[PDB]
Design a protein around this ligand. Structure first.
Ligand SMILES: O=C(c1cccc(-c2ccn[nH]2)c1)N1CCN(CC2=Cc3ccccc3OC2)CC1
Ligand SMILES: O=C(c1cccc(-c2ccn[nH]2)c1)N1CCN(CC2=Cc3ccccc3OC2)CC1
Lengths: 711, 711
């Protein structure tokens, strides 16, 4: 016992495995529920400073397999795990679920055979994943491992013999490996007869049992571990589409461990904990040279967070747990439950203060969440303090996060107007390689930003099941050589696919000072998914196929511009006179003199003429947008629109369970036929208010419609 | 008329639009059905040289919209199209469908308003896509366009006035654009009152109608074209998952045109025809400098085919049409129809001749399709002449194509063992940028090869609806810095997702001289999708978590190796003697002398010991593979296995339409309970033969099971 004379018992001595985990720079597996309790309690403090919590607000129950391999809850001493994978069912009362919400935590035990994945850990991880999925509850994975378990048939090590070419000269080589009768008997005796596959031969009097395959008595040596890895990779791939999946990289995640991080998509990486496929020393043997010095060069945050593999970084395990808990606060308690409403001091009923200007540089985050000023706080579009930005280290040209609109949680995608730089590191494996700095213009989709936008859309959609707002402000895609070669088309197309799959309300809003052009509008138009999408443009937004400079270049050329020079009194007369023979040379020089002096302002006139088409009024006129809006009034508008949309969506889902076979246009028109004759279908607030006042009455109407002889 | 005195009529004079198309370097839209007829006839010649074809073997009917906007067949003169989008319903009798197969061809008319997409072309393209999808028939798109249509309100051009700051000095600027009463009346007269949005003001006696928005009388000027682009992008995204989609880039594909190419996935690009987002001159204005000289720098084959955006290239339009027709020969006639069997001279009943050696370099294509030798033709795994390789210009480390196994069409993925080089071009926009040459080791997945493998899997699955074989031979993923930074994890994970979605039989086969390790096995194990996947390993294959060098490094270290030095007579005695005081220094030097001399061969022994675990016999023993196979006998084995699998799959699909709610294990066990008691369920040939002999009898059994009161 070390240290002596402590006030309370030495927990690292009661369970030496706690000390081993600490020695490896991670939290002991059995101590993670306590971090979730601390993080959950902080959530309450940050929400309502005055709430009195009691220990019954949080319950953690370890899940273990029974005699029939079915998961059951246990209350046992930490460190009694017979396998290197552990799980807990957590039931917490949170500000968004004060009566309680549930989730599962799966975790590697780094103290158990270095956190390696053997067949038993793989089967348990799969069993826990299926448990979460059946219940629709989130699956949190805490990665601290050494990848698939490796081994050899340790019983064949003291027994094997070698068939030397020349016994006296071993250096000259060997023909095969074999067992003697004594070696074979040792195996027979310990009931390890099937540990080897032998073929008996007779060489100079003695019988030799030629080893043809080594199998081994112990399980978890090789391919059986690889089968299990495949099983859990597929299990996670499916879980991502079904439930909320998140991973915290807590010590190091190797091989299957790294794949699990990616397959669950949502990942928080603790600083200094690598996500690797191959270790630096293994790579060094393959390359010959001593190229890498640490695994952090390969899979540290400076790789993974800069990549978008790690959505967030964390300073320590508790910070990571706090980020999981914060992310989950935007997510339904379980699959298909409504999005968790959470109203704060910042009510829906106020104008938007922060307004972008065309002459001044701004941060899009100011439009999203507001900003501190010397004169006070300028509120933005969403609730003060609600913006939880993710993928913050990758493709910084797009701003992705979760936010709240008068309490309604949603995914937000904004456009970074400032030029973004990113540093591509020098490849240590290539001596003729130096660090590259890439500049990327604002309001332009590049391969990386197109991938991030698509990624964001999918992550809001699957598991999170959130509505979304895109504050659309792109000039288009980068059509230059490098970006075309880097497959910009591929990434842009993923955005379309992500929108086609979206199952919750979508609002596309071209904000003030914002724009949408030929290439950018294609990928975000509401006809991609009319059942979910809706588009709005600010009165100070712009949209057209090309930018004014482009439109003039194609449609307001020199001849049109010169014909327009008949708005000029001096030009009209000069063109008329030069249309008696020798004097015509002086008049021709005089026309070219006026045309040269007028050209800069007539170029400006054509630019203005072209821009006059690019207005939200044309968008309304041509029916390409639902409404033209005023930025300061957007919060009030969107709150009720979103609120109205969620209610109608709920009624569309119920109408689907009954009858079944009807189009969405038929279902919505049916639900709308139920509204009082006096209710204006175009009034979002009135429509939401009427539905919320009649949920139980509408239920009775739906239960009555269960007179279905539909064959 | 030019030229005079030709033997037959000048087709370019009868329809001048034919000449315009030719002038633009493309085939006239109305002439594409003839190219399909020529290509279809060649298919017959290459199949059976002796078949007599008549014109009734091929029918092309133009589809146009009726009075109610419903598509109908027409026989009209070419060039009468009132919109710039054209379609044809093609019905062809092919070697795989001698009674006939159908498909739709949609195409831009480059002679119609430069092949631009206006709202009418967009609505027609969408209508044709839905037509194809409803029928389950393939959709071939022929891209020859200028992207979304651009315009201005040409009626406001002669009318608008300018409010100068100083009339006498126009150079000093203007305040706004306006209309006069005379201008307003001109609009009133031509019923174009809503062409502008004005606000009347009175300035120094005269009334000025301030233009606040220009709308225009003509449709297809701006945003209305962008809505249509979005509509067709979403339509194509959906079509890809539903029907066979392919695109031929025939002149140039711009903006929406480029997106359409990608969204349909399968693309054949004609040499010298660019797929661009922004034109070179437009990019040059945005950058200031005159950076690019042609659109081919941006979207030529050297960009798109090297990218994997273009799956194949074609020397001219007919070669492109021939490639479409050849690709389609592997594809079902319509959605959910069986894969088209096509038996050739190369029957299933033969051994595989080409065998890889560990000491000799080979091309994987030799294993796939065979190879010509001075001594004759060495047949490979698949039918002679059946290998149709796609994505051949991108990520050359993986070999992807379609093939036939005794007539059965399937997708094939093979591993290129030879080191692959690829040249990254120098960015013309960056003066401090030079061409990079990248080397990539064989049998290692890199970001590009992982993306291609995933891409291949999805393209075989969607629309093609083909079974697949992966001749799995990877050491793992590149875990080095550059490849980790280039998101190898992301691409590897797409492989898992692609396998999870697969709806047809999958065979994973580790071939002779082949290997599968820790990282590579994870992503391809049959437990990812047990309903479709199956794994086999050749008797000369290898698999384990690490390679022998890795396993020894972790599990057969110096102490184990030194303990093994007790297989040595001289070492055993020397270690015993040095375990009386001064003489012990000489014995310690003598032990280090033997250990140094023995170490190279004992290192080889441990490598051999480790390799003895990596055998297909261990794979069988641990139940991770369905069977261990012999390469020469693989064609015979796989033919019957695949044939058996397709039959059972057919019966599983039928059992699903009836009853409905049963697991696949229940359905298959039920189908198997129908086989005669004497039929060995493990005999593929017997099982396939019995099903094919009793399809009508099994139908009667299924129709009888339609006694379903299942609620
Ligand atoms: O409408 C225009 C435009 C602008 C200026 C000139 C011309 C033009 C049209 C014909 N000749 N020149 C077009 N464009 C459409 C919007 N595009 C946005 C865009 C900006 C951009 C910025 C940096 C790098 C790449 C980029 O490519 C995409 C830029 C070009
Ligand atoms: O089993 C081993 C191995 C090989 C040699 C030494 C060691 C090792 C284990 C511990 N220290 N050294 C491992 N490995 C697993 C298979 N890996 C395949 C691989 C090759 C490879 C080749 C080029 C570039 C990157 C690469 O990374 C992936 C290579 C490393």
């Amino acid at each position: 016992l070390r240290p002596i004379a402590t006030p309370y018992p030495v927990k690292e001595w009661l369970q030496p495995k706690r000390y081993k985990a600490h020695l490896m720079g991670t939290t002991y597996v059995y101590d993670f529920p306590e971090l979730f309790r601390q993080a959950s309690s902080s959530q309450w403090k940050n929400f309502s400073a005055d709430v009195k919590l009691t220990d019954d607000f949080f319950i953690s129950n370890e899940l273990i397999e029974d005699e029939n391999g079915e998961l059951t809850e246990v209350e046992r001493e930490p460190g009694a795990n017979a396998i290197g994978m552990v799980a807990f069912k957590i039931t917490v009362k949170t500000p968004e679920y004060p009566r309680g919400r549930q989730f599962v935590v799966v975790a590697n035990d780094i103290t158990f055979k270095i956190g390696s994945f053997g067949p038993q850990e793989d089967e348990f991880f799969n069993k826990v994943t299926e448990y979460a999925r059946k219940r629709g509850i989130p699956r949190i994975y805490l990665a601290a491992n050494s990848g698939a378990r490796i081994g050899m048939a340790e019983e064949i090590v003291p027994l094997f013999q070698v068939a030397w070419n020349d016994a006296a000269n071993p250096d000259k080589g060997f023909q095969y490996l074999y067992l003697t009768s004594e070696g074979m008997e040792t195996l027979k005796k310990f009931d390890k007869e099937n540990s080897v596959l032998t073929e008996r031969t007779v060489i100079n009097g003695e019988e030799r049992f030629v080893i043809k395959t080594i199998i081994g008595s112990e399980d978890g040596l090789g391919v059986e571990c690889l089968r299990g890895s495949g099983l859990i990779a597929g299990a996670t791939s499916r879980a991502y589409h079904d439930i909320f999946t998140i991973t915290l990289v807590t010590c190091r995640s190797v091989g299957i461990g790294a794949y699990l991080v990616r397959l669950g998509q949502r990942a928080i990486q603790v600083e200094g904990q690598p996500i690797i496929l191959t270790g630096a020393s293994a790579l060094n043997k393959v390359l010959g040279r001593e190229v890498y010095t640490s695994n952090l060069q390969l899979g540290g945050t400076q790789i993974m967070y800069n990549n978008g593999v790690s959505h967030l970084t964390a300073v320590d395990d508790l910070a990571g747990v706090e980020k999981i808990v914060e992310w989950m606060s935007y997510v339904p308690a379980k699959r298909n439950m409504p999005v968790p409403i959470l109203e704060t001091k910042d009510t829906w009923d106020r104008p938007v203060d922060f307004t972008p200007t065309n002459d001044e540089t701004y941060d899009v985050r100011w439009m999203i969440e507001g900003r501190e000023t010397e004169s006070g706080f300028e509120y933005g579009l969403f609730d003060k303090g609600s913006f939880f930005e993710t993928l913050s280290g990758w493709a910084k040209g797009v701003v992705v996060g979760r936010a709240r609109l008068g309490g309604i949680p949603l995914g937000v995608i904004g456009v970074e107007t400032r030029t973004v730089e990113n540093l591509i590191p020098a490849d240590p494996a290539n001596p003729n390689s130096a660090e590259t700095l890439i500049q990327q213009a604002g309001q332009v989709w590049f391969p990386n930003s197109a991938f991030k936008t698509a990624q964001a859309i999918n992550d809001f959609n699957n598991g999170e099941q959130l509505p979304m707002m895109i504050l659309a402000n792109w000039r288009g895609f980068s059509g230059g050589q490098r970006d075309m070669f880097n497959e910009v088309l591929k990434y842009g197309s993923f955005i379309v696919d992500a929108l086609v799959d979206y199952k919750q309300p979508i609002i596309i809003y071209i904000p003030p000072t914002g724009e949408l052009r030929g290439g950018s509008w294609v990928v975000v138009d509401p006809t991609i998914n009319a059942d979910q999408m809706e588009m709005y443009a600010d009165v100070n937004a712009r949209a057209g196929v090309l930018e004014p400079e482009g439109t003039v270049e194609i449609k307001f050329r020199r001849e049109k511009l010169l014909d327009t020079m008949n708005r000029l009194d001096d030009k009209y007369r000069e063109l008329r006179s030069q249309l008696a023979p020798e004097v015509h040379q002086q008049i021709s020089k005089q026309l070219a003199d006026r045309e040269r002096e007028l050209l800069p302002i007539y170029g400006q006139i054509s630019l203005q003429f072209a821009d006059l088409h690019d207005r939200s009024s044309r968008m309304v006129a041509k029916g390409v947008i639902s409404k033209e809006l005023e930025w300061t009034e957007a919060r009030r508008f969107f709150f009720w629109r979103l609120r109205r949309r969620l209610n109608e969506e709920y009624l569309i889902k119920r109408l689907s369970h009954q009858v079944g076979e009807a189009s969405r246009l038929e279902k919505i028109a049916r639900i709308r036929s139920w509204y009082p004759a006096s209710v204006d279908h175009e009034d979002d607030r009135q429509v939401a208010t009427w539905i919320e006042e009649n949920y139980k009455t509408l239920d009775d109407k739906l239960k009555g419609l269960k007179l279905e002889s539909f064959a």
